[PDB]
Write a protein that binds this ligand. Structure first.
Ligand SMILES: [Co+2]
Ligand SMILES: [Co+2]
Ligand SMILES: [Co+2]
Ligand SMILES: [Zn+2]
Ligand SMILES: [Zn+2]
Ligand SMILES: [Zn+2]
Ligand SMILES: [Zn+2]
Lengths: 72, 74
C-alpha cells in the first residue's frame, strides 16, 4: 500500500500545529534559537519572533521550512 | 566512476560570499523578500538585515539556510 509525499508532510504538519497549540512558548523559543544561531541579538530578533506569534499559519510555515526543513 | 567534485554546498558557498561582496544591497533585499513571505514587516525585519550586514560570516550562513535551504555541516 501507498506512502504519499502528501501524507508524510500532513503527518508532520499535524504534530507541529498540535505543538503550537499545546506549548506555544516552546515553539517561539525554537524560532528565537534558529535566528540567534546567526549572531542576531534578542533586541533585533524579538519583534520578528513576536510578529510570527500573531500570524499562526505563517509561524507554522516557518517551523515547517526552517525548523524541520520540509516544503509544500 | 565514484564521485569527488566539490558538492552543491561548497559551490553555492563560494557564489553566495562573492554576491555578499559585489552586491551586498541586493543580498539584503533577498533577506527582506524571504522574511516578508512570513508576513514580517520592514520595521520588524529591518534591524535583522542591519545586524547580518555587520557580520559577513553570519550573513553567508543565513542565506545558505534561508535562501538556498542548505545546512552548515559538523
Ligand atoms: Co545591538
Ligand atoms: Co543570495
Ligand atoms: Co543573490
Ligand atoms: Zn515540532
Ligand atoms: Zn517543538
Ligand atoms: Zn557527484
Ligand atoms: Zn546567491
Amino acid at each position: 500500500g501507498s506512502h504519499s509525499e502528501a501524507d508524510n508532510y500532513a503527518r508532520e504538519l499535524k504534530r507541529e500545529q498540535e505543538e503550537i497549540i499545546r506549548v506555544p512558548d516552546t515553539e517561539a523559543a525554537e524560532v528565537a534559537e534558529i535566528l540567534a544561531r546567526y549572531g542576531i541579538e534578542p533586541h533585533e530578533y524579538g519583534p520578528v519572533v513576536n510578529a510570527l506569534r500573531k500570524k499562526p499559519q505563517a509561524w507554522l510555515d516557518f517551523m515547517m521550512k526552517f525548523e524541520l526543513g520540509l516544503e509544500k
